[PDB]
């Protein structure tokens, strides 16, 4: 990885030493990225609805998985699953239960920095996974994506800045997430998030990250282009929340 500092740095060498999930995947890949595209297609919101019991920016909020899946199996272009331990209290197990109840896609959300965690979201039944551009270099990077390809995954590969960015462009990166919080101060800051939102050019498929709370944000990043929103926090604590921005 990349010299990281504080908590990032911690996450990271936690990361390393994460032990392999050794079992067969039973189900077939699902394209997020794709299922995102048809959505758009077909005018319907696309909205990724993520399941983390803790994280850094909020209230710990307890909640069973399967339950919150199947709900948003209904309504949720995929599901966002976090399986960071530590800081936000996910793991293996609750991704291996949810994947087998549902059929959506699903990204496994976690601080990806070797194969192995590539491996294990594949035979825990992720369609898919999250690397993050400014803990890894654009050779870690452009490996675990090409390594991730090689499975029929695309990665949903998160940005933050101007830096992020041109890295992301240049290792040939067609799915990307911008964050508007950033991961190491945890501030949020959306002009900064529409400002790179408009340095991304229209054929890779662009999902927004965080800060969102009301429908017409929605609307207007919508109008942005974006092409689909990750939610967490609200919906963790009303899930219904979703038949709002839904609409």
Same mark, same amino acid.
């Given at each position: ?26 189900? =077939? ?26 994280? =850094? ?58 194969? %192995? ?37 695309? =990665? ?44 991304? =050019? ?31 926090? %609200? ?13």
């Amino acid at each position: 990885p990349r010299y990281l500092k504080g908590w990032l740095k911690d996450v990271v060498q936690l990361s390393l030493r994460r032990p392999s999930f050794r079992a067969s995947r039973q189900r =077939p890949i699902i394209s997020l990225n794709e299922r995102i595209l048809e959505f758009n297609k077909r005018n319907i919101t696309a909205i990724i609805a993520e399941y983390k019991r803790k994280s =850094p920016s909020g209230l710990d909020v307890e909640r069973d998985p399967i339950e919150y899946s199947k709900f948003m199996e209904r309504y949720a272009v995929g599901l966002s699953i976090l399986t960071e331990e530590k800081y936000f209290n996910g793991s293996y197990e609750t991704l291996r239960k949810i994947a087998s109840s549902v059929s959506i896609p699903i990204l496994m959300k976690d601080f990806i920095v070797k194969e %192995s965690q590539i491996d294990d979201a594949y035979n825990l039944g992720a369609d898919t996974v999250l690397l993050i551009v400014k803990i890894l270099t654009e050779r870690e990077l452009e490996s675990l994506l090409e390594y991730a390809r090689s499975y029929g995954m695309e =990665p949903l590969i998160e940005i933050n800045d101007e830096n992020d960015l041109d890295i992301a462009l240049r290792i040939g990166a067609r799915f990307i997430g911008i964050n508007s919080r950033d991961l190491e101060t945890l501030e949020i800051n959306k002009e900064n998030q529409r400002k790179l939102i408009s340095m991304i =050019p229209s054929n890779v498929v662009k999902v927004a990250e965080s800060g969102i709370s009301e429908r017409n944000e929605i609307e207007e990043l919508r109008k942005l282009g974006v092409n689909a929103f990750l939610i967490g926090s %609200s919906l963790m604590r009303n899930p219904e929340k979703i038949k709002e921005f839904i609409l």
